[PDB]
């Protein structure tokens, strides 16, 4: 993980905030290379990979409620399948999976990205946002740069 060259000046995709429930869905998903969303969220998610047709990448930058952190960043690998197997995850009630593929691993202090704001949520914070709440794509580089460099 955790490349050295990761190149953050995107021209093409779309990336989306994950809020996690619990740190267990990120060791299972890290550990399985799959993650799952509320129906809500997967449709979204779904959407979006679906839209773009392999022509560009949709990435996740994760975050676990209540860390104060981003954990790090994914690239959804799969369309997601709804029929699945319940009580895989932390909200135990969940279907549906897709394959994603991790990129970084590594915890980012959200005083680092607070200043970024989502000019589509109200002006917020990056920091303040929901689960898959979408990130225009020039404020997605500068989150992007600074994961990718954060020390």
Same mark, same amino acid.
């Given at each position: 993980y955790n490349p050295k060259d990761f190149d953050w000046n995107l021209k093409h995709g779309r990336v989306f905030i994950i809020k996690s429930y619990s740190e267990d869905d990120i060791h299972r998903s890290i550990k399985y290379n799959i993650w799952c969303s509320t129906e809500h969220g997967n449709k979204r998610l779904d959407a979006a990979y679906r839209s773009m047709n392999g022509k560009g990448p949709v990435y996740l930058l994760f975050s676990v409620n209540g860390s104060g952190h981003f954990c790090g960043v994914a690239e959804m690998k799969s369309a997601v399948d709804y029929n699945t197997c319940a009580? +895989?995850?932390?909200?135990? /009630?969940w279907k549906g999976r897709f394959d994603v593929r991790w990129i970084f691993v590594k915890d980012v202090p959200n005083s680092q990205l607070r200043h970024i704001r989502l000019e589509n949520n109200e &002006? /917020?914070? +990056?920091? &303040?946002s929901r689960d898959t709440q979408e990130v225009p794509l020039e404020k997605a580089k500068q989150v992007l740069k600074i994961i990718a460099s954060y020390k």
């Open positions: 009580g +895989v995850w932390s909200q135990d /009630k &002006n /917020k914070p +990056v920091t &303040n």
